[PDB]
């Protein structure tokens, strides 16, 4: 778990804005930028998988998720749902209807939905805590810092942004190392193709 205070402190130090009195960058701006960074980080690395198992009937037809990034598996009464669409097809094959963080089934059928998806748990207060591995700290800083360096404070801000991009790439490499060590098999040989 990462506290927001330490991310904020590192960003303030890096922006030469570690002054309690002045705060040229408002904390609302920093919290919004941290939300954006959490968005991008959780989308690119698929950090947070969530499972929701609800029921849809004729009364309520939609399943309201929260902070949706992507759906990787849908079951309806232990039956695979195959295609995804946003158009509300009248009849045909059974598809999953996505309505911008509302989930239903296109040629509607009474039943239950077991959906696997991805989530943010974004923050709104400086005293909150980000439920992410500590290795994700440097990728949060260096990603939110590139978002703020492009305020035209200095004539050489974009070269500094370019340097921070490489630093961010290295941080992402570290994060990928961690994720592979956690959630991946410890294998050393491949399997023969069986057809």
């Amino acid at each position: 778990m990462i506290e927001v205070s330490e991310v904020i402190a590192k960003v303030r130090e890096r922006l030469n804005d570690n002054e309690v009195g002045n705060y040229e960058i408002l904390d609302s701006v920093l919290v919004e930028n941290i939300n954006q960074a959490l968005l991008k980080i959780c989308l690119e690395f698929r950090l947070k998988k969530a499972i929701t198992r609800s029921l849809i009937t004729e009364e309520e037809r939609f399943l309201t998720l929260n902070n949706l990034l992507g759906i990787e598996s849908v079951k309806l009464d232990k039956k695979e749902i195959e295609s995804r669409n946003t158009i509300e097809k009248d009849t045909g094959e059974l598809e999953l209807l996505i309505l911008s963080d509302r989930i239903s089934v296109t040629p509607f059928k009474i039943g239950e939905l077991e959906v696997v998806y991805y989530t943010y748990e974004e923050i709104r207060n400086i005293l909150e805590t980000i439920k992410l591995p500590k290795i994700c700290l440097d990728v949060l800083v260096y990603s939110v810092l590139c978002n703020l360096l492009e305020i035209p404070n200095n004539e050489t801000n974009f070269s500094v942004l370019a340097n921070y991009k490489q630093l961010l790439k290295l941080a992402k490499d570290n994060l990928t190392n961690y994720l592979s060590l956690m959630y991946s098999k410890n294998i050393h040989f491949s399997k023969v193709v069986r057809v």
């Binding site: 491949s190 399997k191 023969v192 069986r194």
Partner: protein, 67 residues
Amino acid sequence: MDFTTLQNDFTNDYQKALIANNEFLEAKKYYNGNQLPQDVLNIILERGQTPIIENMFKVIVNKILGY
């Protein structure tokens, strides 16, 4: 002529003919398809591979016995 020397001479004859009877049973196992060892079979089956056994000397013995 009694049980004592019969048991002792059977032990002496069986222990000195075990290294050849083991090779006889190995040869009869190799003739009947059982040609791969256990560790080689495990190494093949851990990769998801089907172990193929080419019984190339069964047809040789079958040719000589057919003569």
